[PDB]
């Protein structure tokens, strides 16, 4: 009966109904002290949605690169790789600079109270750059898939796809027949993954309702106070990054911003609620093929962009750095501000593939400017932003995914 009517209704409109209702209901229950009820019963339905998305990440990445790399010539793949790497560094570098400007205007944490509390552990030492680069080659190809290591998986899939093309050009019929059979089986696996993604988004309206309700009930109350200025500075900066950066580049290269934003609305919104770039990859890759991007292009740029490209995260580090200093009353020299920009860019690619790189990257920036986290006083200031980290996390992820899609279109247009 009514089961069908739920289906024909547009999916995107159903998400907006859940998102608005989740924020409204979350605030009401939090005010009347019913946070435990939301945590016990409402949250598990939200956790089901994120587990479904993370299940498809590994099979869809390996299968897409093998098919994608086979279609594209080896020479063209090199030109695509160098272009996208240059794009990531420039956009991330400018995002940090934009965050510095916003912090100065708002001037957050001028007179916030400081109290001694729990001390953070000694910051994790970043692995040497030579170890990061050498870890791209997987010692065991099957071990990388089982352990969910994205970066080693990309390396093995690209070379496997290239080797298949040479086999299909051989003069031996037996070798040619075997190569086509292997490629067809892998191609079928990729197509099956996309079919599952469509079914998952039908459950998305329920999933988005639970996640927003839980966070607002427990954490939305703490926005009031000096932390409100921090939230205003970050979100205004994030809004500028989407408009002042991405839209300008799209106009320069001839891509229509209005046409692009219509296709990318699905990918942008789902990243806001899940707050996981890796979990959004199945949706993001589905959006890329809809625009008409070539299979070889988006199969390689999007998985790499999720790991290394952090535009919204970079702006978060720049704004948070000023807040800590303002709490202590320290003053940042113009030369020291330039040090932040260089440190943030290097840390983005210097922590590729390490678990929980968010903590390490922020610690490295604080150490560079002369404010080690080991200082007990900065730890109290640090543990103040983490009070509203989850709320800022929701908007931080949206910019990260947007930067990935914008770069893919620019390279695709240049491809011809
Ligand atoms: N949450 C974002 C994401 O999932 O990409 C982003 O990244 C956080 C993160 C999470 C796990 C590992 C590394 C970095 C952030 O700063 O919030
Ligand atoms: Na970037
Ligand atoms: Na990104």
PDB file of N, CA, C and O in Angstrom, residues 20 42 54 76 139 169 184 198 234 264 267 312 326 340 361 387 394 405 409 415:
ATOM      1  N   UNK A  20      15.766  18.790   8.579  1.00  0.00           N
ATOM      2  CA  UNK A  20      15.129  19.867   9.329  1.00  0.00           C
ATOM      3  C   UNK A  20      14.472  19.327  10.592  1.00  0.00           C
ATOM      4  O   UNK A  20      14.578  19.929  11.668  1.00  0.00           O
ATOM      5  N   UNK A  42      17.597   6.345  19.556  1.00  0.00           N
ATOM      6  CA  UNK A  42      17.629   7.033  18.269  1.00  0.00           C
ATOM      7  C   UNK A  42      18.959   6.799  17.562  1.00  0.00           C
ATOM      8  O   UNK A  42      18.998   6.563  16.348  1.00  0.00           O
ATOM      9  N   UNK A  54      30.205   2.615   4.463  1.00  0.00           N
ATOM     10  CA  UNK A  54      31.598   2.201   4.583  1.00  0.00           C
ATOM     11  C   UNK A  54      31.825   0.773   4.107  1.00  0.00           C
ATOM     12  O   UNK A  54      32.976   0.387   3.877  1.00  0.00           O
ATOM     13  N   UNK A  76      48.367   9.285 -21.070  1.00  0.00           N
ATOM     14  CA  UNK A  76      47.381  10.255 -20.608  1.00  0.00           C
ATOM     15  C   UNK A  76      47.209  10.207 -19.096  1.00  0.00           C
ATOM     16  O   UNK A  76      46.952  11.242 -18.471  1.00  0.00           O
ATOM     17  N   UNK A 139      53.162  -4.609   0.375  1.00  0.00           N
ATOM     18  CA  UNK A 139      53.897  -5.868   0.447  1.00  0.00           C
ATOM     19  C   UNK A 139      53.003  -7.048   0.088  1.00  0.00           C
ATOM     20  O   UNK A 139      53.434  -7.970  -0.614  1.00  0.00           O
ATOM     21  N   UNK A 169      46.266  -7.113 -26.397  1.00  0.00           N
ATOM     22  CA  UNK A 169      46.859  -6.808 -27.691  1.00  0.00           C
ATOM     23  C   UNK A 169      47.836  -7.880 -28.153  1.00  0.00           C
ATOM     24  O   UNK A 169      48.533  -7.681 -29.153  1.00  0.00           O
ATOM     25  N   UNK A 184      35.993  -8.683 -17.693  1.00  0.00           N
ATOM     26  CA  UNK A 184      34.535  -8.684 -17.618  1.00  0.00           C
ATOM     27  C   UNK A 184      34.049  -9.003 -16.210  1.00  0.00           C
ATOM     28  O   UNK A 184      33.080  -8.402 -15.733  1.00  0.00           O
ATOM     29  N   UNK A 198      22.163   2.831  -4.929  1.00  0.00           N
ATOM     30  CA  UNK A 198      20.826   3.387  -5.111  1.00  0.00           C
ATOM     31  C   UNK A 198      19.884   2.933  -4.003  1.00  0.00           C
ATOM     32  O   UNK A 198      19.074   3.724  -3.505  1.00  0.00           O
ATOM     33  N   UNK A 234      34.293  30.153  11.299  1.00  0.00           N
ATOM     34  CA  UNK A 234      34.579  28.999  10.452  1.00  0.00           C
ATOM     35  C   UNK A 234      33.558  28.888   9.327  1.00  0.00           C
ATOM     36  O   UNK A 234      33.919  28.737   8.154  1.00  0.00           O
ATOM     37  N   UNK A 264      25.781  18.029  -8.341  1.00  0.00           N
ATOM     38  CA  UNK A 264      26.574  17.764  -7.150  1.00  0.00           C
ATOM     39  C   UNK A 264      25.815  18.008  -5.852  1.00  0.00           C
ATOM     40  O   UNK A 264      26.412  17.911  -4.776  1.00  0.00           O
ATOM     41  N   UNK A 267      25.801  14.753  -3.607  1.00  0.00           N
ATOM     42  CA  UNK A 267      27.058  14.412  -2.949  1.00  0.00           C
ATOM     43  C   UNK A 267      27.399  15.406  -1.845  1.00  0.00           C
ATOM     44  O   UNK A 267      27.928  15.019  -0.796  1.00  0.00           O
ATOM     45  N   UNK A 312      38.479  22.124   3.598  1.00  0.00           N
ATOM     46  CA  UNK A 312      37.778  22.581   4.787  1.00  0.00           C
ATOM     47  C   UNK A 312      38.554  22.310   6.062  1.00  0.00           C
ATOM     48  O   UNK A 312      38.519  23.107   7.003  1.00  0.00           O
ATOM     49  N   UNK A 326      45.065  33.687  21.239  1.00  0.00           N
ATOM     50  CA  UNK A 326      44.274  34.757  21.839  1.00  0.00           C
ATOM     51  C   UNK A 326      43.913  34.435  23.282  1.00  0.00           C
ATOM     52  O   UNK A 326      43.828  35.336  24.125  1.00  0.00           O
ATOM     53  N   UNK A 340      52.509  29.300   9.220  1.00  0.00           N
ATOM     54  CA  UNK A 340      51.328  28.448   9.332  1.00  0.00           C
ATOM     55  C   UNK A 340      50.922  27.911   7.966  1.00  0.00           C
ATOM     56  O   UNK A 340      50.569  26.734   7.825  1.00  0.00           O
ATOM     57  N   UNK A 361      47.988  16.592  12.460  1.00  0.00           N
ATOM     58  CA  UNK A 361      48.177  17.805  11.667  1.00  0.00           C
ATOM     59  C   UNK A 361      48.034  19.058  12.522  1.00  0.00           C
ATOM     60  O   UNK A 361      48.824  19.999  12.392  1.00  0.00           O
ATOM     61  N   UNK A 387      34.959  20.776  22.482  1.00  0.00           N
ATOM     62  CA  UNK A 387      33.577  20.787  22.931  1.00  0.00           C
ATOM     63  C   UNK A 387      32.598  20.987  21.790  1.00  0.00           C
ATOM     64  O   UNK A 387      31.501  20.423  21.794  1.00  0.00           O
ATOM     65  N   UNK A 394      30.627  18.717  11.028  1.00  0.00           N
ATOM     66  CA  UNK A 394      29.563  18.541  10.043  1.00  0.00           C
ATOM     67  C   UNK A 394      29.782  19.440   8.830  1.00  0.00           C
ATOM     68  O   UNK A 394      29.666  18.993   7.684  1.00  0.00           O
ATOM     69  N   UNK A 405      35.238  17.322  -6.219  1.00  0.00           N
ATOM     70  CA  UNK A 405      34.419  17.331  -7.426  1.00  0.00           C
ATOM     71  C   UNK A 405      34.787  18.491  -8.342  1.00  0.00           C
ATOM     72  O   UNK A 405      34.782  18.343  -9.569  1.00  0.00           O
ATOM     73  N   UNK A 409      36.132  18.210 -12.535  1.00  0.00           N
ATOM     74  CA  UNK A 409      35.545  18.855 -13.706  1.00  0.00           C
ATOM     75  C   UNK A 409      36.580  19.670 -14.471  1.00  0.00           C
ATOM     76  O   UNK A 409      36.571  19.688 -15.708  1.00  0.00           O
ATOM     77  N   UNK A 415      40.776  17.771 -20.607  1.00  0.00           N
ATOM     78  CA  UNK A 415      41.061  16.517 -21.297  1.00  0.00           C
ATOM     79  C   UNK A 415      40.618  16.573 -22.754  1.00  0.00           C
ATOM     80  O   UNK A 415      41.338  16.114 -23.648  1.00  0.00           O
TER      81      UNK A 415
END
